[PDB]
Amino acid sequence: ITCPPPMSVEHADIWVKSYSLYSRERYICNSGFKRKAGTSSLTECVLNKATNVAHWTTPSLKCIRD
Fold it and tell me: So which domain of life are we looking at?
C-alpha cells in the first residue's frame, strides 16, 4: 500500500522514494526559502475513507525567503 504522487506546494521541493500508507512528509522549501509566519506544509498520506487510497492532504504552504 503506496500513495499517488504528491503534486502540490509550488515554491518547494520534496523527496519520498517509496511513499507509504499513513506517512508524513514536510516540504524542504525552495532553495533557501523559509515558511512564512503560520504556514503549514504537512503532506500526510491520509486514508480518504472512500477511494481506499491515502492521498496527500491539502497543504497551502507559503515558502518565501529567507
Answer: Eukaryota
